[PDB]
Amino acid sequence: FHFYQERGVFYAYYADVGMPTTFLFSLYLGTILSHYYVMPLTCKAISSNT
Amino acid sequence: YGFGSFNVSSYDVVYSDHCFSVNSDFCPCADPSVVNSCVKSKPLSAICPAGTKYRHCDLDTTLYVNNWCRCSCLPDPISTYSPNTCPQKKVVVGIGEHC
Amino acid sequence: VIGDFNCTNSFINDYNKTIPRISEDVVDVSLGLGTYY
Ligand SMILES: *[C@@H]1O[C@H](CO)[C@@H](O)[C@H](O)[C@H]1NC(C)=O
Ligand SMILES: *[C@@H]1O[C@H](CO)[C@@H](O)[C@H](O)[C@H]1NC(C)=O
Ligand SMILES: *[C@@H]1O[C@H](CO)[C@@H](O)[C@H](O)[C@H]1NC(C)=O
Ligand SMILES: *[C@@H]1O[C@H](CO)[C@@H](O)[C@H](O)[C@H]1NC(C)=O
Numbered sequence: 001f002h003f004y005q006e007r008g009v010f011y012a013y014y015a016d017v018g019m020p021t022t023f024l025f026s027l028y029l030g031t032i033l034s035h036y037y038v039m040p041l042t043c044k045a046i047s048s049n050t
Numbered sequence: 051y052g053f054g055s056f057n058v059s060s061y062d063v064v065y066s067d068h069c070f071s072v073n074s075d076f077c078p079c080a081d082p083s084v085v086n087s088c089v090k091s092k093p094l095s096a097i098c099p100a101g102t103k104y105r106h107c108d109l110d111t112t113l114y115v116n117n118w119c120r121c122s123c124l125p126d127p128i129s130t131y132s133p134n135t136c137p138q139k140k141v142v143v144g145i146g147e148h149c
Numbered sequence: 150v151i152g153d154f155n156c157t158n159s160f161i162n163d164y165n166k167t168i169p170r171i172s173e174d175v176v177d178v179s180l181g182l183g184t185y186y
């Protein structure tokens with residue numbers, strides 16, 4: 001994934017087959033994004049004991 | 051923080067002149083415990099949300115005046131021009147973006 | 150934190166100071182990793 005911002009606009013690129021990404025979408029916002037976060041995935045059975 | 055509206059006429063157009071930028075943990079309400087220690091020029095305080103940080107106040111002590119809370123942003127961010135101390139930093143609008 | 154709204158506060162481990170060591174890696178753009186069309 002590429003996620004960047006420029007002049008009010010937000011741009012997303014993605015790939016699943018291969019390393020270079022292709023264009024997914026853009027979105028006008030008018031504001032500046034300042035933070036991100038990756039959420040914790042509360043699963044049940046993915047761990048080392050599983 | 052409850053910007054409700056600007057009372058204007060029917061066909062008034064509003065324009066700004068001073069735009070300010072803050073961080074994303076900014077709270078103008080003071081701490082509700084350092085107000086329980088000061089006397090002179092006591093501030094207004096409340097509860098700030100989960101992640102924000104209150105306004106800092108110095109505990110100043112002199113020979114003419116006792117323990118007083120010397121906090122920032124005095125008189126106002128528009129006219130306080132020692133502006134490395136009030137968090138509302140002045141900005142200028144960029145292309146494509148709003149104030 | 151992330152939001153400022155108390156959805157649920159059951160099973161909250163608020164008594165800890167050990168920051169989890171996250172990980173590191175080195176980016177290598179030599180085969181095209183990091184580019185786009
Ligand atoms: C999962 O990893 C543990 C770590 O030692 C190992 O003992 C266990 O046999 C592994 N189980 C499977 C199903 O791979
Ligand atoms: C504008 O609205 C406020 C709140 O309703 C009111 O106090 C004020 O008097 C109004 N302005 C005028 C000129 O009436
Ligand atoms: C958060 O909400 C839950 C509702 O289940 C409540 O039990 C808890 O007391 C709330 N936390 C605070 C700090 O009020
Ligand atoms: C943090 O929690 C872990 C287990 O939950 C415990 O082993 C450790 O001693 C804790 N550290 C502190 C500083 O509380």
